[PDB]
RNA sequence: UUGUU
């Protein structure tokens, strides 16, 4: 596929860039690999891991299968472990999720989707609830899209008062 | 009691 950058750990801090590559060519063109360093003092040091990025998702998948939880580096007490790179996260679930205030305590996770399906695809909706299953009278709605998050805020913060609420509706980003 | 993942 198109291309990845994978985090690996339990690699020998004593490996270098050249010694990864050569692990990781076996299964895929490598666009190129970082080491992680820790300049805390005098030599900078491995952190006994590597990013690599493979110009295909195919070629990434393939090294995965074949390495991780599978292959056990020199030295090493554990075999590779192989993930897609923090940086790589792109929809992160935090930035499409909204947090909704000052709905009716009444309000149904089904209400709350109605009320925002106009906006987008709902990925997830949420009632927060007490102990007693009594609503806590607010909700997270997660869209697929935070660009639809946007405009459900644009559209729905404060546009209404719901039963029994102080206050309008509040919509916005949650924490 | 405006209650946040």
Same mark, same amino acid.
């Given at each position: 596929?198109?291309?990845?950058?994978?985090?690996?750990?339990?690699?020998?801090?004593?490996?270098?860039?050249?010694?990864?590559?050569?692990?990781?060519?076996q299964y895929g063109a490598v666009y190129e690999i =970082?080491?992680? !360093?820790?300049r805390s003092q005098n030599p900078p040091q491995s952190k006994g891991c590597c990013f690599v990025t493979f110009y295909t998702r195919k070629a990434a998948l393939e090294?995965?299968?074949?390495?991780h939880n599978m292959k056990v580096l020199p030295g090493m007490h554990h075999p590779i472990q192989m993930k897609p790179?923090?940086?790589?996260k792109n929809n992160a679930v935090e930035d499409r999720k909204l947090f909704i205030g000052m709905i009716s305590?009444?309000?149904?996770? =089904?209400?709350? !989707?109605?009320?925002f399906s106009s906006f987008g695809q709902i990925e997830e909706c949420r009632i927060?609830?007490?102990?007693?299953?009594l609503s806590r009278g607010?909700?997270?709605?997660?869209?697929?899209?935070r660009a639809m998050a946007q405009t459900a805020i644009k559209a729905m913060h404060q546009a209404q008062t719901m039963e029994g609420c102080?206050?309008?509706?509040?919509?916005?980003?949650?924490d």
């Amino acid at each position: 596929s198109d291309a990845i950058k994978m985090f690996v750990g339990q690699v020998p801090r004593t490996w270098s860039e050249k010694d990864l590559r050569e692990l990781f060519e076996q299964y895929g063109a490598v666009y190129e690999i =970082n080491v992680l !360093r820790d300049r805390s003092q005098n030599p900078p040091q491995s952190k006994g891991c590597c990013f690599v990025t493979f110009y295909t998702r195919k070629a990434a998948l393939e090294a995965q299968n074949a390495l991780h939880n599978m292959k056990v580096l020199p030295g090493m007490h554990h075999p590779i472990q192989m993930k897609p790179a923090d940086s790589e996260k792109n929809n992160a679930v935090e930035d499409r999720k909204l947090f909704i205030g000052m709905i009716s305590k009444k309000c149904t996770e =089904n209400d709350i !989707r109605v009320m925002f399906s106009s906006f987008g695809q709902i990925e997830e909706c949420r009632i927060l609830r007490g102990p007693d299953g009594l609503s806590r009278g607010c909700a997270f709605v997660t869209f697929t899209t935070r660009a639809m998050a946007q405009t459900a805020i644009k559209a729905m913060h404060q546009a209404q008062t719901m039963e029994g609420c102080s206050s309008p509706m509040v919509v916005k980003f949650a924490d």
